[PDB]
Structure 1
Amino acid sequence: VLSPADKTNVKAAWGKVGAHAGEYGAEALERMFLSFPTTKTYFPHFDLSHGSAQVKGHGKKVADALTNAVAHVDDMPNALSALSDLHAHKLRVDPVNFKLLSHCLLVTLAAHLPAEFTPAVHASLDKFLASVSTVLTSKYR
């Protein structure tokens, strides 16, 4: 569960990301495809090379969903309900991949937010991303 301090930390860090949310989402995806090539199996229809409009567009979608989750941090199962339906019935990404994307989001944030990515904030962000991932895989079976 996210503590009061976790929620403060996530709001502060994601707020600092600010206008960069879409850029960072796309960067995390790129880092994921390069670092963990098995994740590319879910995107046979994408150009996955650097500067891909498809990866940029998808990064924006991912980032905007995270922004919505932060906005509804105390009601994520419901705020993400439609998205979790899509994941369970269409996308059907194995749960391990959410941990890979989450890690790449942390790496992205670390690379951009030197002062803000403290050990406590890193901890809270990891919990937050795991919580989002849990909601998104909750309806699989």
Structure 2
Amino acid sequence: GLSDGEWQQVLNVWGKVEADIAGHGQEVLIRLFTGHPETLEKFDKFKHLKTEAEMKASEDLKKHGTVVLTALGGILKKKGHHEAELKPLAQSHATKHKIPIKYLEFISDAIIHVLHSKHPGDFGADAQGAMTKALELFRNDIAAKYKELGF
């Protein structure tokens, strides 16, 4: 889906995330939950987080942030050749977690937002184009498996 140039940008940007995977993960999930509270309802382990202060204080939210972004980082490093890596996540998110694809669009928007917020002026126009394309590629492939499943 992406040029070599663009994957190079993606993985350069991802270097920022890897310097603090838990901090980026936490902010991504906070941005997701605060912006779209219905998403929090999908996590019976975060459902108790009534306030953003409680979210910020939750070490388990940070932990999940690390899981989510580690899984994404793994995927991104495959530069689109990610069928094996994406399959179980499509299946778990459609069949077990019941996550509509729209919420994957929300978390993609949250990643772009967090990158800007944590790295203002350091996440260039090209970098945003490339990262956006990578996230859409990820979403588009998840969506194909959701359609296979009828979800």
TM-score of the two chains, using structure 2 as the length reference: 0.84
Per-residue deviation, 1:18:
2.2
Corresponding residue of 1:68? 74
Corresponding residue of 2:24? 24
AA at the equivalent of 2:100: D
SS at match of 1:43: coil
CA distance in 2, matches of 1:45, 1:20: 23
Structure 1 residue runs of 5 or longer lacking an equivalent are none
Number of aligned residue pairs: 141
SS at match of 2:56: coil
Per-residue deviation, 1:78:
2.3
Conserved 8 A contact 2:10-2:131: yes
Conserved 8 A contact 1:13-1:116: no
AA at the equivalent of 1:57: K
Q: 1:74 to 1:34 in 2, by over 3 A?
A: closer
AA at the equivalent of 2:87: S
Conserved 8 A contact 1:25-1:60: yes
Post-superposition Cα deviations, 1:37-58, rounded to whole Å, max 9, x if no partner, equal 1212212332433221221111
CA distance in 2, matches of 1:136, 1:56: 24
SS at match of 1:75: coil
1:81 partnered with 2:109: no
Partner of residue 125 from structure 2, selected from 113, 119, 122: 119
Q: After TM superposition, list the pairs within 5 Å mapping 1:42-53 onto structure 2.
A: 42-46=42-46, 47-48=48-49, 49-53=55-59
Which of these two proteins has the greater Rg computed from alpha carbons?
Answer: 2
CA RMSD, 1 decimal: 1.7
Corresponding residue of 2:104? 98
Corresponding residue of 2:52? none
* Runs of 4 or more above 3 Å deviation: none
Structure 2 residue runs of 5 or longer lacking an equivalent are 50-54
Q: Which deviates more, 130-139 or 106-115?
A: 130-139
Per-residue deviation, 1:136:
2.8
Q: Between the two proteins, what is the percent identity of the paired residues? A: 27
1:35 partnered with 2:41: no
Corresponding residue of 1:131? 137
Q: Which deviates more, 119-128 or 69-78?
A: 69-78
Post-superposition Cα deviations, 1:91-140, rounded to whole Å, max 9, x if no partner, equal 12011111111111111111122343111111111111122222333322
